[PDB]
Amino acid sequence: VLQDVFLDWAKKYGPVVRVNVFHKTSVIVTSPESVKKFLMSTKYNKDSKMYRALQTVFGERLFGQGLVSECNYERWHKQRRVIDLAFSRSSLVSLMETFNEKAEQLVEILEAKADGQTPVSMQDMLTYTAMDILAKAAFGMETSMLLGAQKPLSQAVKLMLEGITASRNTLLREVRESIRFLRQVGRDWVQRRREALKRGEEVPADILTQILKAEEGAQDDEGLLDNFVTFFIAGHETSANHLAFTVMELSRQPEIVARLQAEVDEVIGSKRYLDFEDLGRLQYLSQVLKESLRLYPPAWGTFRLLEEETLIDGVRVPGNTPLLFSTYVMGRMDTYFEDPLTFNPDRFGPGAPKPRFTYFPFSLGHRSCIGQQFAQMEVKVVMAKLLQRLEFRLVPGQRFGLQEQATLKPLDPVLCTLRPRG
Ligand code: HEM
């Protein structure tokens, strides 16, 4: 993948290198001090040039000026300030019911197939789960993709994704159809929501709540669709990929798995539901998930606009330049991580110095992932429940490896046979 080329040029040509990404030129910056400087300061903002191909796609607007697309600091801080509320400790804690429900449903579906012969795309399974969690926790809707439902909606997302890929690398407008379908799904849910809140009905505190709250005084509900499609995608795709990677990797780490089983047996035993309080105790699982994001971050990095020509690690960089930051790249440099290709959870063990600006799967600073804790909670619940109940062996001819689509994800879907643990 392209990221591997950047890795090689970073190792070979130093901490500051000019490259072509998405057919614009920019400078990839791979020193931790530069990461700190540019990401930990409100002075530096996203580069609208890089994000415009995501703002709109093949004529149909997609993410618009959503919470991710929006580059202007002030328009952004307005949205963020209110959407933050849907992510407070109390909000997250009230999500445990949704996470538990969906994870249990997944484990049940999978146990039904666990004869050691039926192959299963863990990639697909993990995606339906992530989408079901997101759809309910964010918008209060049941999609039931784990149970065969909303197949069209599933296809839209699928194509809408391939679309974005092409939209920004191409050296079949089902895509435009899809982008529209998605936006209409949004219109419908936003609607079902208003229609219930004008039956004066008691609806609890969602992400959806806050996005509407932030689109007040808006002549159109077009920015409200922006945010809808934004969370709808941001909120399931990278989590599903993160899951898929972790499972791909674990299938060839029997020792790691043993220690994880051991751990989950103690912390949760055989209870069906994890309590919010249990998550904190899943120390070692948490290390595994970190080491997974280091080698396989679904979101490889971010861009910032350098406006004043500045000096960067002894290199004059011209003003108006897109700076590229890559956690994928840094994760794989022997300069920052000893023996980088080796998957080792102890890197994050208690007592190890935390990586210092060389690891940022959720990015850093004011534009960091608003959903970080949400995703870390969700991901522990699903992994815990898998570890508690199943064993996964990978089917022959499945490659370990990676592809650079809209985000990084496993090269092959992750085909496995399953046995009940025992
Ligand atoms: C393991 C999963 C996830 C990873 C690795 C991840 C990663 C990050 C990263 C690297 C960005 C991009 C920063 C940039 O483009 O400069 C991002 C932004 C963001 N993420 Fe996630 N994310 C994950 C899950 C979530 C979830 C579950 C949600 C939604 C509930 C979400 C919502 C967003 C949003 C809205 C932003 C933009 C925030 C802002 O600029 O204010 N993410 N995240």
From Swiss-Prot:
Q: In which tissues is it expressed?
A: Expressed in brain. The mRNA was broadly distributed with higher levels in gray matter zones and lower levels in regions rich in white matter. Not detected in fetal sample but its expression increases linearly with age.
- GO terms for CC? dendrite; endoplasmic reticulum; endoplasmic reticulum membrane; postsynapse; presynapse
Q: In which pathway does it act?
A: Steroid metabolism; cholesterol degradation; Lipid metabolism; C21-steroid hormone metabolism
Give the E.C. number(s).
1.14.14.25
Q: Where in the cell is it found?
A: Endoplasmic reticulum membrane; Microsome membrane; Postsynapse; Presynapse
The cross-references to CDD domains, in alphabetical order and at most eight, read:
CYP46A1-like (cd20613)
Function in brief = P450 monooxygenase that plays a major role in cholesterol homeostasis in the brain. By promoting constant cholesterol elimination in neurons, may activate the mevalonate pathway and coordinate the synthesis of new cholesterol and nonsterol isoprenoids involved in synaptic activity and learning.
Q: What is this protein called?
A: Cholesterol 24-hydroxylase
- Source organism (scientific name): Homo sapiens
Q: What is the lineage of its organism?
A: Eukaryota, Metazoa, Chordata, Craniata, Vertebrata
